[model samples]
Target: PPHSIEAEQSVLGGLMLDNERWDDVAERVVADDFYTRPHRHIFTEMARLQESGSPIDLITLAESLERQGQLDSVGGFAYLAELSKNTPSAANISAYADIVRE
Candidate 1:
């Protein structure tokens, strides 16, 4: 798939792992760019949280998802926790986005 679900998850994980890395791809990517529905919802919520000046940690992300009435739709908190654990590293965030866009 051109979407690169792995890359999408990596980017999301990277963002959660290192909140400081969000700026690297915030302008280059959006929810629509994601291949999977879960990824799309997750990224959308991430952007919203970031814009609202809220921290983007796991708990906060879960809360944000819940607030949007999308926690269960996006695989609940378990998916978010798994994403965080699967992130190889935050340093590759830009590269992950590159793959996701390709």
Candidate 2:
């Protein structure tokens, strides 16, 4: 209901498509930067996994959320698995991050 939902979705989608782009998004965003509460948690988890050198994909993200007792809060595995579906092209991640940051 606040912030740029399109940008938030794009960033998550881009990350799901290419986790290597996390640095691009991370450099511009923090957990609280996301207006969407679930997205805030999602980005934080992604950052955590990335910093620890763990692979960041749907299954891994879901597992991490489950471990943190947050999977259901973020719309469960179905939501996590579907994040990549409507993602913008990976090449536009920086642009997406900019929008998210705005």
Candidate 3:
């Protein structure tokens, strides 16, 4: 899978930091590089919020996951809450998007 764990973590970290950055990430990164199953839901919901005209904070994100009934399989509220722990500056969103792009 040539997996890049930090790549996905920090990339979404950057996106959640700035909701508007999804525009750029979408342009640069396509999809399917997410080797981890739970990560897919995390990113898909982020895109969902982007198009739905909502913000990407965990408050909104968690509820969507709850609606999908994936909060448990997606690792629950605690998991989503900690994703940003690795996201230092969140300034290089698109760059990490490239990493997640494979």
Candidate 4:
């Protein structure tokens, strides 16, 4: 089964944030071809988490951006939110059970 855009963003966001480099944040997000609208928000959240090591609840972070008037222009958080609902994360790697007999 495949995940929606939302699920992917959530997972990728977490992974990118977990990275130790600040520059990679912009590089990965802004890179050509694979870039999506919501990825920006996901990256933003990840960057914040990486920088501050603070818990980033979705609403709180979004609201903070809103207050700063940077929400809409910040690569559309709404898009990421919706995508995160269904998008699968990079951290997701699972295998199925099987049996073999001789």
Candidate 5:
């Protein structure tokens, strides 16, 4: 795998923790940069939520994925929660995104 799983999670987690970080992180890396099927799906869905003027958070993300019928495929709300909970620092998403720019 040519992906930095931890770094990718950090980027996604950061976005979830603070939707305000979306612009910065999104500009830094696209969904494909995540390097995992589920990760790419997660990032793409988050982008969609943002595009729809929805705030990107655990609840919104989970609900959005559920509506898209992709919730279970990506590991459900528990997985999303874990991403946020395991994030080292949400404020450093730009840096994390850089690492995930693989």
Candidate 6:
């Protein structure tokens, strides 16, 4: 139950879609308004970099999470490598990259 990817994604999607739900998340959670801290921190960091115009790559993104003490929570560096090898996508790639660039 600790690693239900689908359930986690469902919650992530809900947090992304509904402002009220996001508020509930913010009121209860630690890493920000998002339902999950790693996801929220990564996204906001990326947005900040983007706002200041930073180009992020996968390698650096992975490193960023390592520095932030969060890359392990979602899946860790090994899982990131696994995702890259088997189920790569712009979103997935972007997700990893965002965290590292910061």
- TM-score winner: 5
Question: What residue pairs clash in candidate 6, if any at all?
Answer: 60-100, 61-100, 61-101
- lDDT tens digits by residue: candidate 1, 1-102: 355578898899888888878887786687888888999888888888888999787889998888888999999889999998988772578877777867
Q: Scored by CA lDDT, what does every candidate get?
A: 0.84, 0.81, 0.77, 0.44, 0.85, 0.43
Candidate 3: give the clashing pairs: none
Q: Work out the TM-score per prediction.
A: 0.90, 0.88, 0.86, 0.44, 0.90, 0.38
User: How many pairs of residues collide in each model?
Assistant: 0, 0, 0, 11, 0, 3
**Which candidate achieves the best lDDT against the true structure?**
5
Rank candidates by TM-score, best first: 5, 1, 2, 3, 4, 6
Please report the TM-score between candidate 6 and the true structure: 0.38
lDDT of 2 by residue, 23-63 (tens): 87889877887887889888888888999999788878888
Error of 5 at 94 (Å): 0.5
What is candidate 6's lDDT per residue for 12-99, written digit by digit as tens? 3333332234334333333343445555654454444434545333455567668888787756767445433443222332232223
lDDT by residue (tens digit), candidate 5, 1-102: 334688788888878888988999989899877677889999999998899899989899998899889999998888999998998662578777877775
**Stretches > 4 Å off in candidate 6:** 1-45, 88-102
CA lDDT, candidate 1, residue 36: 89
True-structure RMSD, every candidate: 1.9, 2.4, 2.3, 9.7, 2.2, 10.2
Identify the superior model by lDDT, candidate 1 or candidate 2.
Answer: 1
lDDT of 4 by residue, 44-101 (tens): 5545754676544455556666777777765557643554454334443111000000
Residues 9-94 of candidate 3: C-alpha lDDT, one tens digit per residue: 87777777777788888887654668788888788878878888999876788888898898998789887778766577725777
Model 2 ranges with Cα > 4 A deviation: 1-3
